[PDB]
C-alpha cells in the first residue's frame, strides 16, 4: 500500500524516515512544492532502504498520489520575522486551500493526516477545505504528549508504559491537559496503587512540566520538532493501514466537546481504515473538564478569527 | 547495549533516530559541546519511543561515554585546509573518547571518511581494525539495489562492490559481481535483462552521483548515512562478523602503503577482523590504486 | 542471553520454537532424560533459525543450564494421584536446575500450573516470586481478543482479566473490564455493539472451553502455550516489569492462606515483582475464593 | 493476504504456526479431511497471536481458500507396516489427485508448495496433475539443507552466513550434491579463502554429515521432522507474498538436468508472486555434475514407476 506525503520538509521527510526504517507500507510519495527537494530526500532515504526494509520511496506530483491509503499533509510557511500571529496562520490556510483539494483530486479515498502546526488548528481548516466527514481529517494532536506521560508515570512506578493508561487531551499545546483523575494502571487507579505500592504535587508538577514543555525544550534547543512526529506520524499511518482500530489522542473535529461547538481538539479516538470512528470519553474531574472547556475555547477563538 | 556518539548534528542525530528506530540498542549517548542541543536531539527520538523501540536515548559528557562498546565519530563539518580542521577537531575527540570507553569501536562518519579514519587511526593508538570507517557502505548498497531493480531479482542475491574512495574516485567492481554465483552479465543475458554499456553508465551515474543530487536540492545528506552506520552498530554489538565495505587503516593496497579506503571486511565486536580482497579487472585495479596514492598524500600532507 | 528447558516434549518444543522464531534469547537449552529426544527437537528447530532469527538451540543437561536467567518446567504429563507423580518429578527437578542456575525465574508450566507451581515453590526454597506459573495469561488473551472482535476495536485497548485456577474454575472478571478507560459494557453501548448476557455466555464458553475443543479434535495444546511462555520469558529478560495475569504463591486471597492462583501481577527480571488487585463483584469474590479454597485443599493433599 | 494449508498434520501446523508467530500473512486457513484436527490447530495457535502478531488462523473448507495467494500441501497418509515403498507413493499420490483440483477449483491462481515428502517426488505429481505451467508449483526441496549447509561453513570460518553462498542441489534426501566447488564467501571462492585466512577432507565429510544425515537423526530420536520445515515454508511463503523474486533451491518440474528430462528436483530457482520465475545454474565440478546427474534419474525412476 501507499502513503502520501504533501509537504516535504523536516517533519514530512521525517515521517518518510520512519515509515521506511520501520516497514509501515511498501510505497512512499513524497510532494513539494521545491521539486528538488522532495527528489533529495526520497534518494537519500532511499540510501537507507537498504539497511531495514524494502519500501518505496519516491518524490512525485499529486497524480503519484493516486491510491494512497493515507496522505500526510506537513506543508506549511515559515514565519515572516514581524509579521502576527494571526497573519501567518492565515498564510498557511492558504497553503491547505491549495493542497488539500489537490490530494482529494488525484486519491478521493485517502485519510487525511494533519501535522502542520498548529496542528489543530490546520486539523479545522483541513476538515473545512476537504468537504469529507469528520473522521477522515485526523490530526496528530497529543500522540506524544500523552506517551511521554505514560512513559513518565510508568518510570515513576516503575512499571511498563503498555500497563499505564494515561491521556492528554485538547489542544496540542500550552492548554492541553493531563488527566490525572481517571489515569490506571492495570485497570487500577494511577493515584490510589501509587499510593501503596504515591504522588506528591511535587511530583505531579515535575511530571508535567516533562510532559507539557518537551516541544518547548527541543524547539529552543534544535529550532525545530520531527523526530518525534515522524515516529508517532508513522504509527498512526500504520493503524490505517491495518485497520488496526486502535485508540490514540488524535485531532479531529468533534461536533461539540464541553460546551464549545464545531472545533478540532484532541480526544481518545479509535482509529481505522477510514479515520477516527469513534470517540471515547473517559471520566474527566471538574478541574479537567474546566481545562479542556478552557482549551476548546481557544482553538474555537483562533478558529474563528482565521474563519472557519 | 550501549553506544556513543560525538558530534549531534544531522548525520550524528539522524544515526541515533536509526539506532532507536531498528531498536539496535539499549543506550544511545549523544554528545556535542553545544549541549542544548545534544538534549534538544535526544528528546526529539526520545518523542518517538514509544512508537518504536524501548531505546534509552539521552545526551551526555565523553564521561557518560563510559562502557559503550562502540562510539560513532560524526564531528566537524562536511579543501585541503577544511581537512586539516577536522583533523584538529579528532585530536581534541578520539582521547577524550577512548579514556571514557577505552574499549569502544570508534566508527568514523565524517567526511572525507577515508582521510579521517587514517587520522582516527593514528591518533586513536588501537590496533587497525578498531577504527572503522563507513566507507562505501552506502555505494555498495546502491549499486546493488539498482541492478537488483534491473534484474529484477532480489537484492540479497546480488553481489556487487563498491571500493576504494569514498567519493568520485569510487570503484565500482563490475568485473567480479555476481547474482546467485553467477557472472554478473550472463545471469543477466540469461533473464533477458542485458547489461548494455548504457545501462551500466547509467547505473553508475546513479551510485557515484547521488550525493551531488542530494546536496543540490537538499543541502546535505543524512538519512542514509544514519541507517547505514546503524547497521554497522548492530554488526559490531551482535559481534556478527558479516562482510561490509567499510574504511579501514591498510598496510598495503595496489601498491600504496599504510593508507585507509574501503575493502570488503569482516565486522565483529572488536572492528574490522578480516580482508576480502575479490577480483579485479586491470581498470578496476589501476583506479583502486590511483584513488589509493590520491588519499595517501592528502594523508601525508596532514602529517598522518 | 540464555534460557532452559526441562522437558522435551511438546509444550517444552513449542516454547523452544516460539523462542527461536520470536528470537527472544540468544541460547536456548532443551534438557530431557531422554536426551535423543531433546536433540532431535534442537536439531529440528536449529533447522528453522536461519529462516528467523540467530537463536543457538540446542540440547544438554541440567549442567548446561548454568548462567540461565529463566528456566521452563514443563515435565510430566497432563485425577489426584497424577499430580502426586508430577510432584515427584518436580522434586527430582527443582533441586537439580536451583543447582545449576541458583538465580534463575523458574516457569512452571505443567498442569496444573496453579497446583504445580505452589509444589515447585515450596521445593525452590526460593522467594515467592522467582517461581512463575503460566497460569491463566492464554486465558485473558483470548478473552480481551474476543471482545476485541466483537467491539470491533484493537485488543491493546481492551482491558479484562481472567483470574483463579486455570480451568473451569476460572473467574472471567466482567465487573471491572474497561476499553479505553471506561467500562466495558457502557463503552459497548456507546460503540453500538452492546453485550448482550447471550453474547457474554457465547464469550465464555469461547474462553472457557478453548482447551477442551482443542484435546478433543487434537489430543493436546502447545502451540498457544508456547508463544504465551516465550512472551513471559521475554518480560524477565527485558526486566519488562509488565503486568500479567501468571499464577504465583500468594499469602493470602479472598480468604485462603499461602495458595497460589493467578493474579494480575508485575513480572521482571526477578520473576514476579508485585500485584494488582482488580475491583471483583460479589459474585467474582465468591468464585475466586471457592476456586481458592479447591486448590488449598488439593495442595494439602499433597502435603505442599 | 490469505494463505491456504491442505493438510493439518505436524508439518501444516507447525506452517501456520510459524506463519502467525512471523506474521508473514494476515489470513491463513488450513484444511483437512479431520475438520476437528484443523479446528483444534487453528484454535490453539490462534491462542499465540496474542503474543506475536495480528493474523486470522481458522480452519475452513476448499472453499475457504478462495483468494489464497498460496497453498501449502502438507497431506498425506502414514505407510502402513509391510507395504512397499511405491505402495505407500501410490497412496500419496491418490491422495494428491483428490487435493490438486480441489485447490485449483477454489483458488486458481495460487502458486502450490508442496511439503510432502518425498517432496521431489511429490512436486512431479502435484505439477502433472495441476494443468498449469511449472513455475506455480513448487516444492520446498532442499532450502533447508543448503541453509544448513551455509551455517555449517559460516560457523567453520568464522563469518556470517549471509556472506556464505552454498547451495545443495537434486533430491531432498540421500542423494543431495553439497556444490563445494562453487561455494563463495564474500563472492570470493570458499575453499581458495579458507586455505589462508582450509578445508580438510575430514572437515568437508564432518559437514557433510551435519546437512546430509540431519533429518535422518531428527526423525530417529522424534519420529518427524517439521518445526524446520514450518519456518521454511513460511519463508517460502513470504517470498511468494512479497513478490521478492529471491534465490531459493527449490523442487520444481524441470525440462532437463544434466541429461534426464522432464524431473522435479532442487536448483537454484527465483521465487516470487507467480511461483519460480526462472533458474540460476551454478558451475558445478565433473563430480558434481555426475552426483545430480545420479540424483536426477533415482526420481525420475520413481516418476515412472509411479505414472508420472
Ligand atoms: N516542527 C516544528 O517544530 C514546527 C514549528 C512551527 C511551525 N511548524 C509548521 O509545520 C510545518 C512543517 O514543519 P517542517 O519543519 O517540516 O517545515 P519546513 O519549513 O522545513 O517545510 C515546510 C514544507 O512545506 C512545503 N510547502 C509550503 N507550501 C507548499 C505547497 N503549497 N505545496 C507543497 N509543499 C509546500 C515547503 O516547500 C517545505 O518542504 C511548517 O510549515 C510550519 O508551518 C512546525
Ligand atoms: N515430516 C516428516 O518427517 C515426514 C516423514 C515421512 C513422510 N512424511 C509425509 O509428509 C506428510 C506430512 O507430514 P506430517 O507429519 O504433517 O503428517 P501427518 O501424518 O501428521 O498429517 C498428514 C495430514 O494430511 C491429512 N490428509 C490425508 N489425506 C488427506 C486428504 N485427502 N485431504 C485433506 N487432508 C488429508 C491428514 O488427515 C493429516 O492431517 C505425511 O502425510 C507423510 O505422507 C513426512
Redesign the interface.
Given at each position: 500500500m501507499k502513503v502520501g506525503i504533501v509537504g516535504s520538509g523536516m517533519v514530512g521527510?521525517?515521517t518518510a524516515?520512519?515509515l521506511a526504517?520501520?516497514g509501515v507500507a511498501r510505497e512512499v510519495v513524497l510532494v513539494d512544492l521545491?521539486?528538488?527537494?522532495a527528489?533529495?530526500?526520497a534518494?537519500?532515504?532511499?540510501?537507507?532502504?537498504?539497511?531495514?526494509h524494502?519500501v518505496w520511496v519516491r518524490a512525485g506530483s499529486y497524480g503519484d498520489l493516486e491510491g494512497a491509503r493515507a496522505v500526510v499533509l506537513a506543508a506549511g510557511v515559515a514565519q515572516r520575522p514581524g509579521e502576527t500571529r494571526l497573519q501567518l496562520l492565515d498564510r498557511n490556510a492558504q497553503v491547505f486551500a491549495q493542497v488539500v483539494p489537490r490530494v482529494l483530486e488525484a486519491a478521493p479515498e485517502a485519510v487525511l493526516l494533519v501535522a502542520t502546526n498548529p496542528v489543530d488548528v490546520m486539523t479545522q481548516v483541513a476538515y473545512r477545505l476537504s468537504g469529507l466527514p469528520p473522521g477522515r481529517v485526523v490530526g496528530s494532536g497529543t500522540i506524544?504528549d500523552t506517551?511521554?506521560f505514560?512513559?513518565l508515570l510508568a518510570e515513576y512506578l516503575?512499571?511498563?508504559?503498555?500497563?499505564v493508561?494515561a491521556?492528554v487531551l485538547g489542544e496540542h499545546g500550552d492548554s492541553e491537559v493531563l488527566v490525572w483523575s481517571?489515569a490506571?494502571?492495570?485497570?487500577?487507579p494511577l493515584l490510589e496503587?501509587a499510593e501503596a505500592?504515591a504522588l506528591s504535587p511535587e511530583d505531579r508538577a515535575r511530571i508535567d512540566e516533562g510532559v507539557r514543555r518537551?516541544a518547548y525544550?527541543?524547539?529552543?534547543?534544535?529550532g525545530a520538532?520531527?523526530?518525534?512526529?515522524?515516529?508517532?506520524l508513522?504509527?498512526l499511518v500504520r493503524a490505517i493501514l491495518?485497520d488496526?482500530?486502535?485508540?490514540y489522542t488524535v485531532s479531529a473535529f468533534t461536533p461539540e466537546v464541553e460546551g464549545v461547538l464545531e472545533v478540532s481538539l484532541s480526544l481518545?479516538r479509535?482509529l481505522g481504515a477510514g479515520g477516527v470512528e469513534?470517540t471515547?470519553?473517559?471520566?474527566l474531574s471538574p478541574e479537567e473538564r474546566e481545562a479542556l472547556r478552557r482549551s476548546a475555547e481557544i482553538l474555537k477563538e483562533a478558529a474563528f478569527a482565521l474563519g472557519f
Open positions: 521527510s521525517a524516515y520512519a526504517l520501520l521545491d521539486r528538488k527537494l527528489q533529495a530526500h534518494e537519500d532515504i532511499l540510501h537507507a532502504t537498504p539497511f531495514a524494502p506524544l506517551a511521554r505514560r512513559a516503575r512499571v511498563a508504559p503498555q500497563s493508561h491521556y481517571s490506571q494502571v492495570g485497570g487500577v496503587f505500592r518537551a525544550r527541543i524547539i529552543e534547543g534544535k520538532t520531527y523526530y518525534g512526529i515522524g515516529a508517532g508513522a504509527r491495518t488496526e482500530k486502535g485508540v481518545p479509535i469513534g471515547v470519553y473517559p471520566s
